[PDB]
């Protein structure tokens, strides 16, 4: 806190707390998506594993931000985690579209914080984001776009067939 803090604006401190909230909310959305695809009336294991893995990744991103907040001498402040935007997530296509909207929102929040850090002349913040978040997001969004295209090519006139095939042949399962 006040004995270590140096070159760490109140504006960046607050924005880091809001970004933690966003990552934890994304983790919660992925938890919901993963358990939806584990329903016996949905039953797509590879899709469940894909989203449950992302729930863990988004948690870990939040935790890295909170570690950094303490390393800089700021104070972590927590807010409510809003419930996810849907209770039921539709098809794998619907879910993957909602995931890429979610990641684009996270990426925009990263970019906005980076611009704040650069305006504040806070290079540790900017490098932190560049090294641990910006490329993770670009890689994930690319993977999701790759998946979207493949899901879309499989719809055909045979949508259940395509949904099965994608889960079996692209996504990771036992």
Which whole-number Å values give the CA distances from 46 to 9, 74, 109, 113, 165, in the listed order?
43, 40, 29, 34, 11
Give min distance, CB of 57 to its own copies, in A. Answer: 14
Closer to its own copies by Cβ: residue 13 or 170? 170
Residues within window 27-66 making contact with Mn ion, judged by CB under 5 A: 34, 38, 48, 52
Out of 14, 107, 120, 171, the only residue in the binding site for its own copies (CB under 8 A) is: 107
Closer to its own copies by Cβ: residue 90 or 156? 156
What number of chain residues touch its own copies (CB under 8 A)?
Answer: 83
Tokens of 59: 């948690």
C-alpha span between 15 and 68 (Å, rounded): 13
Asked if 11 contacts 68 with a C-beta cutoff of 8 angstroms, the reply is no
Residues within window 17-46 making contact with its own copies, judged by CB under 8 A: 28, 31-32, 35-36, 38-43, 45
172 interacts with its own copies by CB under 8 A? no
C-alpha span between 50 and 38 (Å, rounded): 11
> Which residue's structure tokens are 């067939």?
161
Partner in contact with 101, chosen from Mn ion, its own copies, none, beta carbon below 5 to 8 Å by kind: none
């Amino acid at each position: 806190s006040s004995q270590i803090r140096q070159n760490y604006s109140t504006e960046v401190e607050a924005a880091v707390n809001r970004l933690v909230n966003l990552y934890l909310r994304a983790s919660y959305t992925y938890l919901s998506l993963g358990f939806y695809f584990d329903r016996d009336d949905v039953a797509l294991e590879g899709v469940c594993h894909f989203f449950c893995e992302l729930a863990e990744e988004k948690r870990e991103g939040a935790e890295r931000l909170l570690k950094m907040q303490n390393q800089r001498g700021g104070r972590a402040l927590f807010q409510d985690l809003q419930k996810p935007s849907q209770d039921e997530w539709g098809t794998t296509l619907d879910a993957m579209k909602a995931a890429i909207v979610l990641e684009k929102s996270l990426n925009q929040a990263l970019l906005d914080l980076h611009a704040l850090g650069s305006a504040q002349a806070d290079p540790h913040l900017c490098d932190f984001l560049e090294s641990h978040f910006l490329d993770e997001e670009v890689k994930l969004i690319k993977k999701m776009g790759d998946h979207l295209t493949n899901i879309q090519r499989l719809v055909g006139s045979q949508a259940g067939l395509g949904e099965y095939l994608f889960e079996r042949l692209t996504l990771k399962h036992d």
